[PDB]
Design a protein around this ligand. Structure first.
Ligand code: HC4
Ligand code: CL
Length: 359
């Protein structure tokens, strides 16, 4: 057993997904340094978004650092890898990307990002309030893109959407020209883009450049000012699912998410400048808010640096209810590994080069 509580974090600070991981790493400056008087020993590694590196990193944490908790990664593929390692090694894992948490992954993994169906629902609800009958999809040719397309199909169709076109692209692709020509030809009333970070801006710019006039909808993987920096004028009028951390100012004081959002954004934006808030910084910040709640519970009955403590953290994640954080109010169960509800999302648009919450 140790005095310190050991937390390993693998995030993507190089490569195309660096725009997600950099804020996640930077937010660590503003989290707890100590819980219950026990210093937190936080070990941070880059995985480059590569599942192999993330597997290596997670394993370094669980065996070499004897971590009590592991966190990461920034995008879905390395996040699945971390979950594989955490469930084998029996170490609690807080995911920072929204992976499919299957029965094989559920025991030791929970997720900070909003689950795809919560975010889909708020987008499709807007679609059906704004005369959208036909919808096209463009998203990744991998698990994240699949989760979004499957949700559009299942949930979206049931709400009165007809899917008239489906196109995919790979994360590293620098053009989506062919896919966009087909989408523009199909001319759906709206298009849903299933992507994240820099790649989310690519269909935004390509669609507007290549003549698309309909509404464009973006996932919560796009929610940072970076999207507007890259897409520019093509971002105008976009509808975007976001966590509430993007606008704590617009929340009522009664919102449990308001205080922790104001705390993170004030700290982050003091160092990195106005409107540098992000969806992503909030996930690592919120993971520590969760630790603030569950670690004192585990400390009652178990010593840090032991399996008993790992197990106590696992049990506490589902005994401790209504954990307030900047992105939502979490109540995990044995079967619900996201634990979120409507308090975890707002809808954004872009007007005059800035985000505005849609009332
Ligand atoms: O690129 C992915 O696989 C998805 C990234 C993502 C990260 C944080 C979110 O809150 C949503 C999506
Ligand atoms: Cl709380």
């Amino acid at each position: 057993e140790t005095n310190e509580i050991t937390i390993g974090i693998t995030v993507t600070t190089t490569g195309p997904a660096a725009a997600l991981g950099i804020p996640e790493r930077n937010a660590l400056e503003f989290v707890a340094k100590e819980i219950g008087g026990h210093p937190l020993k936080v070990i941070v590694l880059d995985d480059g978004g590569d599942p192999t590196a993330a597997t290596t990193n997670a394993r370094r944490f669980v065996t070499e650092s004897k971590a009590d908790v592991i966190m990461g990664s920034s995008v879905t593929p390395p996040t699945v890898a971390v979950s594989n390692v955490a469930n084998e090694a029996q170490v609690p894992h807080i995911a920072l990307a929204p992976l499919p948490i299957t029965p094989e992954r559920a025991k030791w993994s929970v997720a900070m990002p909003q689950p795809i169906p919560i975010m889909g629902k708020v987008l499709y609800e807007h679609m059906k309030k704004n005369n959208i009958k036909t919808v096209g999809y463009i998203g990744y040719s991998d698990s994240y893109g699949d989760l979004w397309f499957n949700d559009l199909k299942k949930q979206g169709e049931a709400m009165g959407l007809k899917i008239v076109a489906e196109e995919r692209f790979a994360r590293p692709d620098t053009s989506v020209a062919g896919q966009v020509l087909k989408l523009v030809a199909a001319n759906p009333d709206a298009i849903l883009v299933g992507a994240s970070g820099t790649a989310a801006a690519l269909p935004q710019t390509s669609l507007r450049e290549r003549g698309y006039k309909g509404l464009i909808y973006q996932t919560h993987g796009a929610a940072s000012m970076d999207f507007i920096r890259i897409a520019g004028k093509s971002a105008e009028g976009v509808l975007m699912a976001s966590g509430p951390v993007m606008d704590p100012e617009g929340q009522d004081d009664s919102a449990l998410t308001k205080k922790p959002g104001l705390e993170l954004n004030t700290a982050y934006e003091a160092k990195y400048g106005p409107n540098s808030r992000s969806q992503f910084a909030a996930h690592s910040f919120d993971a520590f808010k969760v630790l603030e709640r569950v670690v004192p519970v585990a400390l009652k009955t178990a010593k840090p640096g032991t399996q008993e403590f790992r197990e106590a953290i696992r049990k506490a994640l589902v005994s401790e209810k209504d954990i307030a954080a900047s992105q939502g109010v979490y109540s995990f169960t044995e079967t619900d590994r996201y634990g979120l509800d409507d308090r975890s999302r707002i809808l954004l648009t872009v007007k005059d080069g800035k985000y505005v919450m849609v009332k």
